[PDB]
Amino acid sequence: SKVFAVYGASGCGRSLMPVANEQLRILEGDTDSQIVFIDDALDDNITVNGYTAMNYTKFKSIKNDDKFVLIAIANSSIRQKIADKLVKDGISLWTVQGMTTLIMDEVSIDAGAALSPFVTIAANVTIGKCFHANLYSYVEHDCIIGDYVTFAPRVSCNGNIHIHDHAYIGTGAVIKQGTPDKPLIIGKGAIVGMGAVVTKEVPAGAVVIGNPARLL
């Protein structure tokens, strides 16, 4: 027996719950296991879109040895804090993908990714901890994505790009391909704004916007 959850019942979670149901009901063929929301804003349990929603204290109290959680909180500092709590409490991180999520050859993705509908992860990609790939995003050939990276919808991450930990890539941003000799790097904790057209390396902690991308 198993219990599943989506951690976060705000916009991120409510748009991922249908995806977690595709993952569980169709890709895993599991019509038996319950799935709930976890949200620490809750005191008493409520329902959100027809699913039971409870705080983490209550979720921990459930008498099941086999818990699986997708963290659906876009802020990567919160996501890392929750992931470390879950692992310490002996709860499994759970990767979810949609029926229309395309995974190509020789792809490695660490546990706990949220891979939305219409996402492509192309050939020979490596992805670290609790990746968020929102609707329509792609990661093309030979990319290396670090830990707690977050893509908004419709990110175009071309080939030979290395995105370091905790970077955020905004809606519809486009990133030029690197080369095998010079991968294009997005630095640790960088923020690439909605619609940015990135043609060069982004420094760690930089915020870049515009076409072409410039420091904000």
| Among positions 95, 172, 187, 207, the unique one binding its own copies when judged by CB under 8 A | 172
Q: Is residue 141 annotated as a catalytic residue, yes or no?
A: yes
Q: Residue 109 pairs with which residues in a beta bridge?
A: 127
Side-by-side strand order, sheet with 67-71: 46-48, 51-54, 34-38, 3-7, 67-71, 92-93
37/94 with CB nearer its own copies: 37
Q: Which residue of 45, 62, 211, 214 would you call a contact of its own copies, by CB under 8 A?
A: 211
171 is in an annotated binding site: yes
Does residue number 176 form part of the binding site for its own copies (CB under 8 A)?
A: yes
Instruction: Report yes or no: 144 and 186 within 8 Å, Cβ to Cβ.
Output: no
Q: Is the dihedral of CA 161, 121, 85, 88 positive or negative?
A: negative
Subset of residues 124 to 183 that bind Cl ion, contact rule: CB under 5 A: 136
- Contact flag: residue 51 with Cl ion (CB under 5 A): no
Among residues 56 and 136, whose Cβ is nearest to Cl ion?
A: 136
In the set 23, 76, 150, 156, which binds its own copies (CB under 8 A)? 156
- φ/ψ of 59, rounded to 5, equals -65, -40
37 lies in the site for its own copies, by CB under 8 A = no
The smaller minimum CB distance to its own copies, of residues 74 and 86, is found at 74
Q: Which residue has the tokens 């959100």?
A: 48
Chain positions 102 to 121 lying near its own copies, rule: CB under 8 A, are 102, 104-106, 117-118, 120
- Determine, following the binding rule CB under 8 A, whether residue 47 of this chain makes contact with its own copies: no
Q: Give the residue closest to Cl ion by C-beta.
A: 136
Q: Which of 141, 162, 164, 166 is catalytic?
A: 141
Q: Which of 148, 68, 37 is nearest to 133 (CA)?
A: 148
Could you tell me which of 149, 111, 106, 151 has the C-alpha nearest to residue 125?
106
From CA 105, how far away is CA 124, in angstroms rounded? 6
Beta carbon nearer to its own copies, 65 or 105:
105
Backbone Cα Rg of the chain = 17
- Maximum CA extent, the chain: 55
Residue entry with tokens 């349990």: 45
Residue list for the binding site: 12, 39-40, 74, 159, 168, 171, 176, 194, 199-200
Contact residues toward its own copies (CB under 8 A) are 11, 14-15, 17-18, 49-50, 98, 100, 102, 104-106, 117-118, 120, 122-124, 135-136, 138, 140-142, 152-154, 156, 158-160, 171-172, 174, 176-177, 194-195, 197, 199, 209-212
